[PDB]
Design a protein around this ligand. Structure first.
Ligand code: ALF
Ligand SMILES: [Mg+2]
Length: 1138
């Protein structure tokens, strides 16, 4: 292909033509002189231009054709290439490129090439593509890291930055300036871009058509309404663009080594290959671009990229043997500072001989700049290359045709009846066109985006921010909700229960129930509690890190030190035992694949009670018990039973182990740095078990109960031990019945109390009674072993809890669940779930943050998107899990609102059309003032109706997602039939009361008549009835009578119409040009209107009670026992309210 990228479908090379060769110039300047010559001759006047008003018809038709031909260039892109572009033979003569992306992933566009100095490039979706003469294609930009041969570390270690000004200019020309290009446009630009949309042009054409019939006030009113609607849409788009623009980072001065000297340079002028001095970041800022730490040590907080506030330690590369060892990203993941992440602390703990920077910061080398960073790429995909709210426009554009069928039938009948009695052809054609064009509603494909924006504002009220608005309707039909255990359903403040297994009471199974406090513990246990930790101390005096480490340090009672050392040498009664000091030399970072911490330290520990002096090098390891057994030199005889007994209750336990390398003296940096992961983790002894209690969040039970009671199903995925996950699920009430674990001892079912054990084969199908009678909890090992067998599908339907799941297997499970057609929701916070939030339909990043911090800000609650993250589409700044149902409520509102709007709009249009038809069979037309008053009243009613609130809780019913179904179509057809029958009966009765004169003259300046007033009153009452009868707000919103804001407007307009019909105010009828009535006509009209309203309400209520409830899926179907328990508890809650 012409370009090499998976997000562009096809592209070709074009060249512009001059103005006279355009498709909207030459054929028309051929056609027009011919028509002029035909008009100017008298013998060739037989083509039916004899009447003076057919010249207007032909002129308007030809001008409309020219306008359509011109607008076809702006409506589409392929037609633009066909109308004003010509294909180019080779790249040497090309001047424009037409680029079409992969479908539903952006918008196709034309772009201009630039040729610089040889270099051919072009910008598409704010991304720069460059031509490669060897591959004969365009591609994305290239950097030093992404080269096919992996560069040696000596490229970065011995780098001295850019030493040539010409090289600096060349690098500036090749890449771009380090900034985010999100330029908000002015009001005129958006108005000009929104004035060539097809529906705005259609509305202007309809305005002109109405103006052609001397309807001045109505045309002015609808023009004003269209203008203010476009203005508010443009304002909303501008506000959204400003909110998106507020994500970028303000420039700040930095120190840069250029031309052999240190210079203070702004942040936006950074280039690849530069050598910068990174230091402590300021408030509301971050790192300028992607960096690699050549020398130094950093403590950073990658909040935006992951959503976790736990600090990480980034080390340099000055120690690696970079003379010949190539660069890899698997091993050097700890030496890359990603852009957009705040830096907490800088510490120093050169080969090139460069003098140190004056600010005493660390040294770094820039890798990528601009939009090409990971955060930049995410932002670019977020803003430009993303889905839209509707993105298909298929059901609405068929609904318009469905209405137009009835419109065409009515117009054809009107035309035939008018041509039977020999009316004037021009006026009859204009009336038929006016009937045809009065049916199409211009905002029917819309009104899903506006509801989405309103729901977005309502959600942002609750401190919940959304980045992709097209996922809001997806929240209206979610069938499966996935959750995480650690960090989401568990609190951040842990309590240290104690230490066991250091040495006694014994149960029947052999488990040891000995409970030993933290204060009285062993020498090695206390020492490994002190050393084996990843927590750090800030220079200001604050303590940050993993909360478990904070809890165990508070329980230990030791006091930190400035040079990353721990000591308790001064006499403290809290410790009462081991005292001395320890200095950590090397720290090994936790990863999801190893589940272990290993730390090396220089120790000097003394025990006052018994002596046993300890000095020298030492290594301590903590983590999962199974890995400790994998690296234990002496397996205890009471390990597994005690571990299982202590983890049965839900307490979280961690295995602690120790080893001594040298009995005296320090190890030595030469082999301290030469030590590997496999060499240091061998022949380890056993220290003990640190057992703790994890507290549930106080909103977990309520949120899970609300999600389960509605039309949803909740499953839990975690990377913890199986027994703890099962206990947490049982406390949360995800599972009710007895559960069975499925694990290796190969591929055996076990029980929680280990009373039954079942052997099964991976190939044979699962026993159905196991699926039916009992719940399932499938671990990650057997999930890996079930990759392709026949039991893979069923295991994805009947289980609810997963344990020991790798980050890739989470996205595999989510993809498998999405394969069946179920809509999924995922909530998570850590980096273990970042690979699965994007794969799910809707993802929430539960940023655990204090609400006191949110209230503490004062600038000098709605906030902005700067403090949010880009890990997940939805981000909340509050620790409450109850934020999860709120989203699942808000979308549930939006669809509902959209549904009601559709119905109302369709019915309104239909009624109006047929009303005109009844007027147009008699030769009389509606008045200007009457139609203006009707339009104003309808606009006031719409504005009063459009405001509403939401119900505090979820409901067992679900909204209809699409348009074409039994409910909407049946209700529309029934109400339209009732309205048409009432109108026909009223017209026949009025013809019976007063005979028709049958004198057809078009010189009627609106002489008042009985039929006109009768049809006007009937259509006004019918419009008010269809406004006040389709208020979809019983289960999901508030009722009509419970909110006075629209109720007062409804009753006021109804009272005005009834006062007009009752002839209680004779002046008001003369103010609208109405003929006075008599008693029997008034009574029969009132009864007809009442019957119409009653029948419409009855039909709508019956159809809503019948077909509105969307049935729950088979996965979310609940057993009668759960329903009975729910009913009992609901009646208990009803009784205990007072
Ligand atoms: F903290 Al987890 F799966 F255990 F995200
Ligand atoms: Mg987590």
């Amino acid at each position: 292909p012409l370009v090499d990228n998976p997000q562009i479908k096809s592209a070709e090379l074009l060249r512009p033509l001059p103005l006279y060769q355009h498709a909207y110039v030459w054929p028309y300047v051929i056609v027009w002189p011919v028509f002029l010559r035909v008009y100017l001759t008298q013998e060739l006047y037989d083509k039916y231009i004899g009447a003076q008003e057919w010249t207007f018809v032909w002129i308007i038709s030809i001008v409309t054709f020219q306008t359509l031909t011109w607008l076809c260039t702006h409506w589409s892109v392929n037609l633009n290439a066909l109308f004003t572009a010509k294909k180019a033979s080779s790249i040497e003569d090309a001047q424009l490129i037409k680029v079409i992306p992969v479908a539903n992933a952006g918008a196709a566009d034309i772009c201009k090439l630039v040729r610089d100095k040889t270099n051919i490039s072009f910008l598409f979706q704010k991304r720069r593509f460059l031509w490669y003469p060897e591959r004969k294609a365009f591609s994305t930009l290239e950097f030093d890291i992404d080269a096919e041969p992996k560069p040696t570390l000596s490229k970065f270690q011995l780098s001295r930055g850019i030493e040539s000004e010409d090289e600096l200019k060349r690098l500036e020309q090749h890449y771009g300036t380090n900034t985010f290009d999100i330029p908000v446009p002015t009001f005129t630009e958006l108005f000009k871009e929104h004035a060539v949309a097809p529906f705005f042009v259609f509305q202007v054409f309809c305005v002109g058509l109405w103006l052609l019939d001397e309807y001045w006030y109505y045309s002015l009113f609808t023009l004003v309404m269209l203008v203010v609607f476009e203005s508010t849409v443009v304002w909303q788009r501008q506000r959204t663009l400003t909110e998106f623009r507020s994500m970028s980072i303000k420039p700040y001065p930095i120190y840069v080594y250029r031309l052999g000297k240190w210079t203070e340079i702004q942040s936006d002028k950074l280039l690849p290959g530069d050598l910068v001095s990174v230091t402590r970041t300021k408030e509301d800022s971050g790192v300028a671009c992607d960096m690699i730490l050549v020398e130094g040590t950093a403590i950073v907080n990658e909040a935006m990229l992951s959503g976790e506030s736990t600090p990480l330690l980034k080390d340099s590369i000055q120690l690696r043997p970079g003379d010949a060892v190539l660069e890899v990203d698997g091993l050097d993941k700890n030496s890359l500072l990603w852009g957009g992440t705040k830096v907490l602390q800088i510490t120093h703990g050169p080969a090139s001989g460069i003098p140190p920077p004056p600010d005493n910061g660390a040294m770094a080398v820039v890798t990528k700049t601009g939009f090409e960073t990971s955060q930049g790429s995410l932002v670019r995909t977020m803003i430009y290359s993303t889905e839209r709210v509707s993105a298909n426009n298929t059901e609405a554009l068929l609904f318009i045709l469905f209405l137009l069928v009835f419109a065409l039938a009515a117009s054809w009948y009107v035309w035939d009846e008018g041509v039977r009695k020999d009316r004037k052809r021009s006026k009859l054609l204009l009336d038929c066109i006016l009937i045809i064009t009065s049916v199409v509603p211009p905002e029917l494909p819309m009104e899903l985006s506006l509801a989405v924006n309103t729901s977005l504002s309502a959600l942002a009220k609750f401190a919940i921010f959304c980045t992709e608005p097209f996922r809001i309707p997806f929240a209206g039909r979610i069938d499966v909700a996935c959750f995480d255990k650690t960090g989401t359903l568990t609190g951040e403040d842990l309590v240290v229960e104690g230490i066991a297994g250091l040495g006694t009471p014994k149960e029947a199974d052999g488990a040891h129930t000995r409970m030993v406090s933290v204060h009285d513990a062993g020498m090695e246990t206390t020492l490994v509690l002190a050393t084996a930790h990843a927590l750090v101390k800030l220079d200001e005096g604050e303590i940050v890190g993993d909360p478990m480490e904070k809890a165990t340090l508070n329980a230990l009672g030791w006091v930190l030190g400035k040079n990353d050392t721990l000591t308790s040498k001064p006499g403290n009664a809290a410790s009462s035992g081991i005292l001395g000091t320890v200095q950590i030399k090397r720290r090994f970072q936790f990863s999801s694949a190893l589940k272990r911490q290993s730390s090396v330290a220089t120790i000097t520990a003394t025990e006052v009670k018994t002596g046993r002096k300890l000095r020298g090098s030492f290594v301590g390891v903590k983590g999962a018990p199974e890995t400790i057994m994998k690296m234990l030199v002496t397996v205890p005889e009471h390990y597994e039973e005690t571990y299982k007994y202590f983890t049965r209750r839900g307490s979280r336990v961690l295995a602690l182990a120790y080893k001594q390398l040298t009995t005296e003296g320090e190890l030595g940096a030469n082999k301290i740095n030469d030590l590997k992961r496999e060499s240091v983790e061998a022949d380890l002894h056993f220290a003990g078990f640190l057992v703790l209690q994890c507290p549930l969040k106080e909103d977990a039970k309520q949120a899970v109960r609300m999600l389960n009671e509605s039309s949803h199903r909740v499953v839990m995925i975690t990377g913890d031990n199986p027994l703890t996950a099962v206990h947490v699920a049982k406390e949360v009430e995800i599972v009710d019945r007895d559960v069975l674990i499925l694990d290796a001892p190969s591929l055996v079912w076990r029980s929680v109390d280990d009373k039954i054990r079942i052997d099964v084969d991976p190939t044979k199908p699962i026993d159905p009674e196991i699926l039916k009678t009992k719940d399932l909890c499938v671990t990650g090992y057997a999930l890996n072993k079930f990759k392709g067998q026949v039991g893979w599908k069923s295991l994805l339907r009947y289980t609810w809890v997963y344990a020991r799941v790798s980050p890739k297997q989470k996205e595999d499970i989510l993809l498998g669940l999405k394969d069946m057609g179920y809509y999924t929701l995922m909530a998570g916070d850590g980096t273990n779930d970042v690979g699965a939030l994007k794969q799910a339909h809707v993802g929430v990043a539960l940023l655990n943050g204090t609400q006191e911090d949110l209230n503490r800000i004062a600038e000098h609650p709605t906030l902005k998107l700067g403090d949010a993250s880009v890990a997940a589409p939805f981000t909340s700044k509050l620790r409450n899990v109850m934020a999860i149902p709120n989203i699942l409520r808000q979308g549930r509102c939006t669809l509902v609102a959209t549904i009601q709007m559709y119905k109302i709009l369709a019915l309104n249009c239909l009624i109006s059309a047929y009303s005109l038809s009844v007027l147009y069979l008699e030769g009389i037309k509606f008045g200007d003032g009457q139609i203006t008053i009707s339009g104003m009243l309808m606009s006031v009613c719409f504005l009063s109706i459009s405001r509403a609130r939401s119900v505090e809780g979820l409901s067992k019913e679900r909204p209809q997602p699409n348009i074409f179904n039994f409910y909407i179509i049946g209700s529309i057809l029934g109400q339209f039939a009732v309205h048409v029958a009432t109108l026909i009966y009223i017209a026949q009765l009025c013809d019976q009361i007063e005979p028709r004169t049958e004198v057809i003259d078009l010189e009627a300046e609106f002489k008042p008549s009985l039929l006109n007033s009768a049809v006007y009153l009937l259509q006004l009452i019918q419009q008010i009835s269809t406004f006040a009868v389709n208020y979809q707000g019983r289960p999901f919103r508030e009722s009509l009578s419970e909110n006075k804001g629209m109720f007062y407007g409804i009753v006021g307009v109804t009272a005005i119409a009834f006062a007009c019909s009752t002839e209680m105010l004779p002046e008001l009828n003369e103010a609208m040009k109405l003929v006075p009535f008599n008693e029997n006509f008034k009574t029969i009209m009132t009864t007809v209107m009442i019957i119409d309203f009653v029948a419409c309400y009855v039909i709508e209520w019956v159809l809503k009670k019948l077909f509105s409830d969307l049935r729950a899926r088979d996965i979310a179907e609940r057993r009668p026992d759960q329903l009975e328990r729910e009913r009992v508890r609901k009646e208990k809650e009803a009784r205990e309210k007072e």
